[PDB]
Amino acid sequence: VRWFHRDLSGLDAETLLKGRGVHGSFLARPSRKNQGDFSLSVRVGDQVTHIRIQNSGDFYDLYGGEKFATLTELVEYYTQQQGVLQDRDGTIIHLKYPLNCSDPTSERWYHGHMSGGQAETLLQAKGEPWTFLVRESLSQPGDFVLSVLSDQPKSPLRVTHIKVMCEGGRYTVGGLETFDSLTDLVEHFKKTGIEEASGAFVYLRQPYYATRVNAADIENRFWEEFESLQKQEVKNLHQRLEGQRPENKGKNRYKNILPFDHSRVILQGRDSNIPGSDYINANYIKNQLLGPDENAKTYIASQGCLEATVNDFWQMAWQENSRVIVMTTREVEKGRNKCVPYWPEVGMQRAYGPYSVTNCGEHDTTEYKLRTLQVSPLDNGDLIREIWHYQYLSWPDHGVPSEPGGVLSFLDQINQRQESLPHAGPIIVHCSAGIGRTGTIIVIDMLMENISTKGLDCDIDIQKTIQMVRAQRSGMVQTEAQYKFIYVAIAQFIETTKKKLEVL
């Protein structure tokens, strides 16, 4: 994903593509203060064309193309020539050579968001002289600061700071030498050593690394923290051949959004002699940051739900002994369909293949509805099993909820249900394509669990958790808005649990 450039104006791209790329060269870039917007900068001949890509929460949407799960998948699709990308006027565009850049966004020493105060605190606390760190300058954006721990008392150790100016593209701490990137500069001095404002000569021997991530509560007073995860979709580009059989064609709500082959749910009891018949657009998601000795809920993430897959859906639930179903969308929102129904109306009794499901009741909240379903295989109507349907109904068609309390109740309830049950299978979570809202919900739920199971003194790495689920299903958590949402929701959950009353 080295073709992804964080801070890069549209005009500055044409400049970069024209001075370092060739016909076919392309790079991806953000819009900056224009949420839900990304742009693809292709170099056609000697011109630089731009295609905006929108993402309101369910998937990346390209203008003059199709929908995808991740920018990396989008690129790969067109790069494989799998389709025809075109622009209003200048039709048929081609992608050939990524134009790479070095974004430190994921550097072990990059801490940007950090302030000089929490900088000196953290470095002196580790006490080892020559431990460096870089951060965003609050004084003047675009320019960062080199903060290193020296070996002179001032008692704790004196942390010397250094300014890194960004003279339009290139970088400079003040010397006559300039640098391509932030990493080029950091590597340079890491060996050279660097002279400070005084005469003093410091060394960048080791980057600062923390671990005690818990009372995140303070981060709640992201854009970068998000895109920092972006450069990582490379690792999770697993095979999805199975969802590509011409047969399963009508089993996919979105042509290019498919389940990974290693975690895809396999419909049991099927005719092996029918090409593609054990297929369903859905994956098993687990908290893989836990060991076998550890305990925790597990999930199945699925796409919306077609009239063609309604019965296949019910087979998944039955075979998995799944007792709880979570819907994160209304059947149709703002005009576009999101998920056909798969349940009879209150009191009614419909059959979906070798199964009978009856809607024994409906209960409402301002935010959502709960349908208490009863299901049993026709060939044995006395093997009745209880399945509770949770359908969230207040999510904004655009963006994310204003407050987290609504989704937290939803999740809390869902959890008590699962827990109260004797040997129940994984929880089924779905929406439209099954990657944004469902990704967001499953993560929020996993982070809610380790806090609940272990204490308030545990590790709460949101990023690592999000990167972990993305390994099991492409996309999981789409926009920066959900990213922040996970944070704000958890923080509220923390305070809640951390209530004053010492009932413990």
The annotation status of 432 as a binding-site residue, yes or no, is yes
- H or E segment and range at residue 74: helix 71-79
Are residues 174 and 320 both part of a single domain?
no
Q: Which helix (H) or strand (E) holds 450?
A: helix 437-453
Contact partners, residue 195, CB within 8 Å, separation at least 6 = 201, 202
431 assigned ligand-binding residue: yes
Residue 433 counted as an annotated binding residue: yes
Judge contact between 261 and 239, C-beta under 8 A. Answer: yes
Identity of residue 453? T
Q: Work out the number of other CB atoms within 10 angstroms of the CB of residue 116.
A: 15
Q: Are 486 and 478 in contact (CB under 8 A)?
A: no
Contact (Cβ atoms closer than 8 angstroms) between residue 115 and residue 138: yes
Resolution (angstroms) stands at 2.8
Domain total of the chain: 3
Question: Same structural domain for residues 463 and 368?
Answer: yes
Torsion of Cα atoms, 376 then 281 then 467 then 2, to 10°: 180
User: Which residues are CB-contacts of 296 (< 8 A; sequence separation ≥ 6)?
Assistant: 287, 290, 446, 449, 450, 453
Task: Fill in the amino acid letter for 407.
Answer: V
Write out the E strands in 249-395. Answer: 282-285, 299-302, 324-327, 332-333, 336-337, 349-351, 356-364, 368-376, 385-392
Element (H, E) at 438: helix 437-453
> How many degrees, rounded to 5, is the angle at CA 203 between CA 199 and CA 206?
155
Residue at 486: amino acid letter = I
390 & 371 share domain: yes
- Nearest-5° Cα angle at 273, 269 to 275: 100
Q: Which of 265, 182, 324 is nearest to 472 (CA)?
A: 265
CA dihedral (223, 226, 227, 231) in degrees, to 10, reads 170
> Is there a single domain that holds both residue 12 and residue 121?
no
**Are 289 and 306 in a shared domain?**
yes
Could you write out the DSSP letters of every residue in 83-143?
S-B--SSS--B---EE-----GGG-TTB-TT--HHHHHHHHHHH--TTEEEEEE-SSSTT-
What Å distances lie between residue 116 and 129, 147, 197, 211, 224, CA to CA?
17, 8, 17, 19, 18
**Gap between the Cα atoms of 128 and 126, Å rounded:** 6
Neighbouring residues of 451: CB distance < 8 A, sequence distance ≥ 6: 458, 460, 490, 493, 494, 497
Method of determination used here = X-ray
Q: Which residues contact 82 (CB under 8 A, 6 or more apart)?
A: none
Residues 402 and 298 in one domain: yes
Nearest to 131 by CA among 183, 191, 207: 207
Nearest-angstrom CA–CA distance, 72 and 304: 22
397 is in an annotated binding site: yes
What is the distance between the alpha carbons of residues 502 and 499, in angstroms, rounded to a whole number?
8
Cα–Cα dist 333/392, whole Å: 12
Q: Which tokens in the block code for residue 25?
A: 């060269």
Q: Which residue among the candidates 166, 305, 339, 431 is catalytic per the annotation?
A: 431
- Specify the residue for token string 């050279």: 192
Q: What is the DSSP letter of 34?
A: S
Q: Which domain holds residue 64?
A: 1-102
Is 56 annotated to bind a ligand? Reply is no
| CA–CA separation, 163 and 109 (whole Å) | 16
Contacts of 399 (CB under 8 A, 6+ apart): 35, 56, 57, 481
**C-alpha separations of 468 from 55, 129, 474 in Å:** 22, 34, 11
Pairing type for strands 206-207 and 131-136 reads parallel
Spell out the residues 6+ positions from residue 419 whose beta carbon is closer than 8 angstroms to its own: none
User: Does the annotation list 436 as a binding residue?
Assistant: yes
For residues 123 and 114, is the Cβ–Cβ distance under 8 A?
Answer: no
**Residue recorded with tokens 């204003």:** 402
* Residues 203 and 232 placed together within one structural domain of the fold: no
Helices (H) and strands (E) in the chain, counts: 10, 22
Structure tokens given for 32: 């900056």
What is the CATH classification number for the domain harbouring 188? 3.30.505.10
The reply to whether 179 and 268 lie within a common domain is no
Under a CB-based contact definition with an 8 Å cutoff, are residues 388 and 343 in contact?
no
> Would the annotation count 193 as a binding residue?
no
Q: 157 φ, ψ to 5°? A: -95, 145
Cβ contact 226:71 at 8 Å: no
Judge whether 348 and 361 are in contact, CB under 8 Å. Answer: no
List all residues 6 or more positions away from 126 whose beta carbon is below 8 Å from its beta carbon: 149, 208
Domain boundary among 102, 137, 164: 102
CA distance 236 to 260: 9
Q: Is the dihedral of CA 377, 378, 380, 385 positive or negative?
A: positive
- The C-alpha atoms of residue 434 and residue 415 are separated, in whole angstroms, by 20
The answer to whether residue 101 is catalytic is no
CA–CA dist 447, 453 (Å, integer): 10
Pick the last residue of a domain from 102, 122, 138: 102
Picking from 190, 209, 228, the residue at the C-terminal end of a domain is 209
195 and 299 fall within a common domain: no
In a shared domain, residues 303 and 432: yes
Same domain, 428 and 458: yes
Closest alpha carbon to 119 in 145, 141, 154, 153: 145
Domain with 376 in it: what CATH number?
A: 3.90.190.10
Per the CB < 8 A criterion, the answer to whether 495 and 487 are in contact is no
Asked whether residue 389 falls in the same domain as residue 442, the answer is yes
Q: Which helix (DSSP H) or strand (DSSP E) does residue 42 occupy?
A: strand 37-44
